[PDB]
Ligand binder design. Structure first.
Ligand SMILES: CC(C)CCC[C@@H](C)[C@H]1CC[C@H]2[C@@H]3CC=C4C[C@@H](O)CC[C@]4(C)[C@H]3CC[C@]12C
Ligand SMILES: CC(C)CCC[C@@H](C)[C@H]1CC[C@H]2[C@@H]3CC=C4C[C@@H](O)CC[C@]4(C)[C@H]3CC[C@]12C
Ligand SMILES: CC(C)CCC[C@@H](C)[C@H]1CC[C@H]2[C@@H]3CC=C4C[C@@H](O)CC[C@]4(C)[C@H]3CC[C@]12C
Ligand SMILES: CC(C)CCC[C@@H](C)[C@H]1CC[C@H]2[C@@H]3CC=C4C[C@@H](O)CC[C@]4(C)[C@H]3CC[C@]12C
Ligand SMILES: CC(C)CCC[C@@H](C)[C@H]1CC[C@H]2[C@@H]3CC=C4C[C@@H](O)CC[C@]4(C)[C@H]3CC[C@]12C
Ligand SMILES: CC(C)CCC[C@@H](C)[C@H]1CC[C@H]2[C@@H]3CC=C4C[C@@H](O)CC[C@]4(C)[C@H]3CC[C@]12C
Ligand SMILES: Oc1cc2c(c(Cl)c1O)CCNC[C@@H]2c1ccccc1
Ligand SMILES: CCCCCCCCCCCCCCCC(=O)O
Ligand SMILES: CCCCCCCCCCCCCCCC(=O)O
Ligand SMILES: CCCCCCCCCCCCCCCC(=O)O
Ligand SMILES: CCCCCCCCCCCCCCCC(=O)O
Ligand SMILES: CCCCCCCCCCCCCCCC(=O)O
Ligand SMILES: CCCCCCCCCCCCCCCC(=O)O
Lengths: 128, 339, 282, 57, 238
């Protein structure tokens, strides 16, 4: 059973630091390109960032680029997101996702009508 | 509200996986260790069907093992004969995009699907001599994916909006509809007793549906990616599933968990459509790397390789008497393969 | 020694030509998709004409050159007419090839509409009817022979006639074809180089254009430098200068080119697959 | 209140799916093996057919 | 054995009449060129179908240019999960992709468009298909830049460090800022298309209007370019 468990988050301060964790249970971790996706209040899903099988190639979304570190361990089977320099305009639910096919570079995980390869997600709130 | 509900759901799913782990007394391949291996099995291209213009998406055999329907992307649905390579009917479709075709057990109808969410049934009585559209079913929102005849009165269909209905053709309405899926339902595989069927969605959960009751009995979550096609065992007490993680799986209705997993390191390509043989010993698998792998259903070993296709093996069919196996690829060449 | 050396060269050449034309006719006979395109009909006609060259022209004359005398007698005239027909059929099949390449690259849409398989067959049939009208009427009426061994001194009206209808018109058609196809290909390489350079700019051509130079240039160069000396000799000779041996060697070069014609005109991946399949080497 | 009603349908689903009888693996296995043994000789794919008997040959 | 050979006769005559109809429809189906029209819901691809002309799942448009028949297939009442039915459209001639540009708007749609283009591009079965690009709402980009603030530079820090390319030529009566924005979007989509570097398919970029007539001729020109590049590949020239 493909199941995803996000971890860390909560009410934080701007400029602070926070780790998110994603425990990826029920499949083989190295085969799948994996990604983080976040959801603003009364808005849609937007693709934060992405990481391939080996982990060599990493891209981001420009408006938050250079501010977040995406570590996947293959051995520990976890996906850690490192935040710093928090901005109040970015307060959102956060979601760990997996691209549905193995050994491929394409992903189609932007659908909000009950996409089934994402976790339940964690609320992350910035209060100034 | 939502959190106590999801915690109770998680404790129920822990109860279910306690059940599943209590049940697992042993494995089937340890059980099959003192069993005669089948060995290398060679099959050859007895016939090649030609004259298709575009790629052949889906095809379905008849119950007398004589006439096959083939469904193509040029808008031509061709009723074939397998013995003399004769096109005994050729039918022109309204929409050019097709994703499924069904052939009736009495042979009176052919049904066709596609991307325009309408299931179109054609009568083959031909009192005037021209094939005509007998009826058009339009009640689905998502694309129509795989549709299968119970008889000449009731057709069961699988939409793309996670819904599967049970159509009556006479009323032209939906007798029962069920929406228990979270991901896109690809294909359904009816029973030989036709009291149940199994559907493979894209949320890696195979479902066992009662036709008469109208709700699921069992849920199977052993996969890791999209369940492309599903096929019942000939006794109706087990099914097989193919996925995109290059692993075929065999499932039991009574054990409520997976018996066997079929996986080879050298092939990481997807698995389009899987059909059992008549005896059930050979599981036949249409892979994405241009061949068909003949698994041994009890020993999990590749008998044999049908590398006769130039493009991907889109769908795979087996006659009711087990005589030959017809595979449709995307190079517009339908092969009849015999042992 | 030297005669055995020459027999080894000639035997090897004949084996190579027969192997290549065999493999391309085998490949097309055992493969349907290598027949499904309207293009491949013309390389079928060019393998048929090259296998007629390898089967009828080159063994006979190789025997004649190695023995040094012509023992076969009256077969000389029929040999001459069959090597006019097979040579002109090869050069016409290559001008059919060039006009197919220019009509498919010049108009992409109107070549689907106009090039029915029936037009392919009417091109191949006016090629082989021009080759049998260039050969089996004049040789048999013997207009070339009566200018005043199989050393038939060609008359000037036939040598000028058949040499300009066999070489000079089809290689002016090929030079206007391949120059227009390097106009097209250079405009495409400039557009791809513009988009490439804009991407390079964003992040902060030559290779492909010299693959087009190497392709067009070895296609044009091999065929034209291997048929050019024998039609210079052929047109000069009647009006005169050249030893018989030198004419022999250049006629061998003219025939030699037909061994390289399947390698050059069969660089497709589909033919490489079908030759690994057929041959069984891979 | 829609999501929590789909939660409560999931809950009712899992309550009806928990409460089912479950036959052990090995007897199911043995039944499968039995049925593949019984009908092995009637399979044209497992057992080759003579070409006169074969309708395709 | 008389009735049997008569039934074989009948099957042979019906097979002849069918293979006649097949050959005629083979002619008419090799006439036909197929164009898949993909655009987001914010983008005015209903406006582009209204231009192209002058409850079902798929909507079909037939138009003919220079006696050359085109069918454009417009995805309509379909689900957002689009991968399982995107396999169908490898057989088409070319895929027209239409993306809005709003720089004055709940979420970032430009990033979504880039991600969708990337997923189209790196898809296995969609490698052999060319993609043709329309950057809609250029007039609105012009009108919206003069708002005291710029959305794109917020969303993209690379756009502060960006200069207009010298080979490209802006149209007269245009702001150098607005044309910097245009060319930088165009550069984003071409860096995504040049990243893969396969060489089997290219990305043809176009700057269009809200109300414009010329679009059918641009899609005809890019068709002629796609089948010319296919023949150049096919004879191993390039
Ligand atoms: C593999 C092939 C290329 C080898 C070819 C070897 C040839 C070119 C060599 C080997 C033997 C050589 C001959 C050996 C002896 C003589 C006698 C001398 O008074 C004149 C030259 C002459 C007649 C040589 C001519 C060149 C020759 C024929
Ligand atoms: C010197 C030139 C003018 C001679 C021209 C001869 C032409 C008119 C004749 C000779 C051979 C004939 C072809 C012979 C065979 C076929 C195949 C048939 O299925 C279509 C007609 C077609 C293709 C004929 C077309 C007309 C044809 C090409
Ligand atoms: C296009 C090709 C086939 C045209 C060929 C034309 C030939 C067949 C014609 C044109 C000129 C004709 C010659 C004209 C004059 C004479 C003199 C007469 O006392 C004998 C016949 C003879 C010698 C003719 C033979 C046939 C001939 C040579
Ligand atoms: C197989 C085909 C393509 C080529 C060989 C065909 C041969 C057998 C035919 C075609 C042309 C014919 C020649 C045509 C003209 C003449 C001139 C006449 O006064 C004597 C017979 C003669 C010399 C014919 C002999 C037979 C011939 C040479
Ligand atoms: C086949 C068509 C297209 C071109 C034919 C060209 C022919 C008709 C022309 C071109 C060159 C001409 C030759 C040029 C020189 C001479 C030498 C003279 O003392 C006799 C006539 C003769 C032999 C001419 C005969 C006619 C000729 C051969
Ligand atoms: C002429 C026939 C008989 C032989 C053909 C020889 C070929 C192999 C030769 C002749 C012309 C040569 C080309 C001439 C010019 C260039 C441009 C230079 O920047 C790269 C090398 C390149 C592309 C040469 C490569 C080799 C070449 C293609
Ligand atoms: O005039 C021509 C003569 C010949 C050919 C061609 Cl194509 C001509 O145009 C074909 C090439 N083989 C030589 C042949 C020939 C015949 C007799 C004497 C000398 C050479
Ligand atoms: C590759 C096959 C070529 C076959 C060519 C056959 C040519 C036959 C020529 C027959 C001439 C007979 C002349 C005999 C004269 C005599 O009796 O002295
Ligand atoms: C009018 C005919 C003139 C004489 C013809 C001589 C022999 C020509 C051979 C042509 C071979 C063409 C084969 C095409 C087969 C195919 O359809 O693939
Ligand atoms: C395309 C083929 C062209 C062939 C042209 C052949 C030209 C030869 C003409 C021969 C003329 C013979 C004149 C004889 C006159 C006389 O009887 O004195
Ligand atoms: C395609 C080129 C055709 C060339 C045809 C040349 C024909 C020349 C024929 C000359 C015949 C001379 C007959 C003279 C008769 C007389 O002495 O009165
Ligand atoms: C690729 C070349 C094409 C042109 C060929 C022309 C051939 C000319 C040969 C000249 C040889 C000169 C030998 C003279 C000997 C002597 O003085 O007797
Ligand atoms: C790759 C092309 C090779 C061509 C080989 C051609 C061989 C020609 C040899 C000519 C040598 C003539 C020597 C004669 C000496 C003498 O007059 O006694």
């Amino acid at each position: 059973q493909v199941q995803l468990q996000e971890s860390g988050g909560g009410l934080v301060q701007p400029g602070g630091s926070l780790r998110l964790s994603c425990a990826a249970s029920g499949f083989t971790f190295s085969n799948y390109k994996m990604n983080w996706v976040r959801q603003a209040p009364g808005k849609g899903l937007e693709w934060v960032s992405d990481i391939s099988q080996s982990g060599a190639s990493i891209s981001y979304t420009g408006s938050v680029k250079g501010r977040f570190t995406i570590s996947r361990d293959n051995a520990k089977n976890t996906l850690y997101l490192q935040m710093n320099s928090l901005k109040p305009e970015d307060t959102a639910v956060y979601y760990c996702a997996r691209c549905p096919a193995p050994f491929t570079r394409d992903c189609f995980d932007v659908t909000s009508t009950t996409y089934a390869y994402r976790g339940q997600g964690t609320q992350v709130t910035v209060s100034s | 509200e939502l959190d106590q509900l999801r915690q109770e759901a998680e404790q129920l799913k822990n109860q279910i996986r306690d059940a599943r782990k209590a049940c697992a007394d042993a494995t089937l391949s340890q059980i099959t260790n003192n069993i005669d291996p089948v060995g290398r099995i060679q099959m050859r291209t007895r016939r090649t069907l030609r004259g298709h213009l575009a790629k052949i998406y889906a095809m379905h055999w008849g119950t007398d093992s004589r006439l096959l329907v083939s469904a193509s992307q040029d808008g031509k649905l061709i009723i074939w004969d397998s013995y003399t390579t004769n096109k005994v009917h050729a039918i022109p479709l309204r929409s050019s995009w097709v994703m499924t075709c069904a052939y009736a057990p009495s042979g009176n109808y052919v049904a066709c699907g596609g991307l325009d969410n309408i299931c179109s049934i054609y009568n083959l009585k031909t009192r005037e001599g021209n094939v005509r559209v007998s009826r058009e079913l339009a009640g689905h929102t998502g694309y129509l994916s795989c549709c299968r005849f119970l008889d000449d009165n009731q057709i069961v269909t699988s939409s793309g909006d996670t819904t599967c209905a049970l159509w009556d053709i006479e009323t032209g309405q939906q007798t029962t509809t069920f929406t228990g899926h979270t991901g896109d339902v690809m294909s359904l595989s009816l029973a030989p007793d036709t009291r149940l069927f199994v559907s493979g969605a894209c949320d890696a959960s195979a479902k066992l549906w009662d036709v008469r009751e109208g709700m699921c009995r069992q849920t199977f979550t052993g996969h890791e990616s999209d369940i492309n096609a599903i096929c019942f065992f000939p006794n109706g007490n087990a099914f097989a599933t193919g996925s995109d993680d290059a692993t075929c799986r065999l499932f039991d209705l009574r054990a409520d968990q997976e018996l066997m997993t079929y996986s080879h390191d050298n092939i990481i390509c997807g698995i389009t459509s899987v059909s059992f043989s008549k005896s059930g010993r050979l599981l036949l698998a249409g892979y994405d790397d241009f061949n068909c792998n003949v698994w041994d259903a009890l020993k999990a070993d590749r008998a044999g390789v049908l590398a006769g296709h130039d493009n991907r093996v889109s769908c795979l069919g087996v006659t009711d008497d087990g005589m030959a196996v017809a595979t449709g690829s995307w190079d517009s060449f339908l092969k009849i393969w015999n042992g | 020694s030297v005669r055995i050396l020459t027999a080894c060269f000639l035997s090897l050449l004949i084996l190579s030509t027969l192997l290549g034309n065999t493999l391309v006719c085998a490949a097309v006979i055992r493969f349907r998709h290598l027949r499904s395109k309207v293009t491949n009909f013309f390389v079928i006609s060019l393998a048929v004409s090259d296998l007629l060259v390898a089967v009828l022209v080159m063994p006979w004359k190789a025997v004649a050159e190695i023995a040094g005398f012509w023992p076969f007698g009256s077969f000389c005239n029929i040999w001459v007419a069959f090597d006019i027909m097979c040579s002109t059929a090869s050069i016409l099949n290559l001008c059919v090839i060039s006009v197919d390449r220019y009509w498919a690259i010049s108009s992409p849409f109107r070549y689907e509409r106009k090039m029915t398989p029936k037009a392919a067959f009417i091109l191949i049939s006016v090629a082989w009817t021009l080759s049998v009208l260039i050969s089996f009427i004049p040789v048999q009426l013997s207009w070339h022979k009566a200018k005043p061994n199989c050393d038939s001194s060609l008359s000037r009206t036939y040598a000028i006639s058949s040499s300009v209808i066999s070489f000079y018109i089809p290689v002016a058609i090929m030079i206007v074809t391949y120059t227009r196809i390097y106009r097209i290909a250079q405009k495409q390489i400039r557009r791809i180089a513009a988009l490439e350079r804009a991407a390079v700019h964003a992040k902060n051509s030559f290779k492909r254009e010299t693959k087009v130079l190497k392709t067009l240039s070895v296609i044009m160069g091999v065929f034209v430098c291997c048929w050019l000396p024998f039609f210079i000799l052929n047109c000069i000779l009647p009006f005169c200068c050249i030893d018989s041996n030198t004419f022999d060697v250049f006629v061998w070069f003219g025939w030699a080119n037909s061994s390289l014609n399947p390698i050059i005109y069969a660089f497709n991946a589909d033919f490489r697959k079908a030759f690994s399949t057929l041959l069984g080497c891979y | 209140t829609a999501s929590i009603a789909q939660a409560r349908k999931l809950v009712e689903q899992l309550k009806m799916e928990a409460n089912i009888d479950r036959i052990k693996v090995s007897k199911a296995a043995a039944d499968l093996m039995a049925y593949c043994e019984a009908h092995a000789k009637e399979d044209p794919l497992l057992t080759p057919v003579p070409a006169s008997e074969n309708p395709f040959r | 054995t008389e009735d049997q050979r008569n039934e074989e006769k009948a099957q042979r005559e019906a097979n002849k009449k069918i293979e006649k109809q097949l050959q005629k429809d083979k002619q008419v189906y090799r006439a036909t060129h197929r164009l898949l029209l993909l655009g987001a819901g914010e983008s005015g691809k209903s406006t582009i179908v209204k231009q192209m002309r002058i409850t079902s799942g798929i909507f079909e448009t037939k138009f003919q240019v220079d006696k050359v028949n085109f069918h454009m297939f417009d995805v309509g009442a379909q689900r957002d999960e689009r991968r399982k039915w995107i396999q169908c459209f490898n057989d088409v001639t070319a895929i027209i992709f239409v993306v809005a540009s709003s720089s004055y708007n709940q979420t970032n749609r430009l990033q979504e468009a880039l991600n969708l283009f990337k997923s189209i591009w790196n898809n296995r079965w969609l490698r052999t298909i060319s993609v043709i690009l329309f950057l809609n709402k250029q007039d609105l980009l012009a009108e919206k830049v003069l708002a005291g603030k710029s959305k794109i530079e917020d969303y993209f820090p690379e756009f502060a460090r960006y200069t207009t390319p010298e080979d490209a030529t802006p149209e007269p009566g245009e702001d150098p800022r607005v044309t910097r924005a245009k060319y930088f979007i165009r550069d984003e989509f071409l860096r995504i298309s040049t990243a893969s570097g396969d060489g089997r398919h290219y990305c043809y970029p176009h700057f269009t209007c809200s109300v414009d007539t010329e679009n059918i001729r641009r899609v005809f020109n890019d068709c002629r370019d796609i089948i010319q590049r296919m023949h150049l590949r096919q004879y191993e020239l390039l």
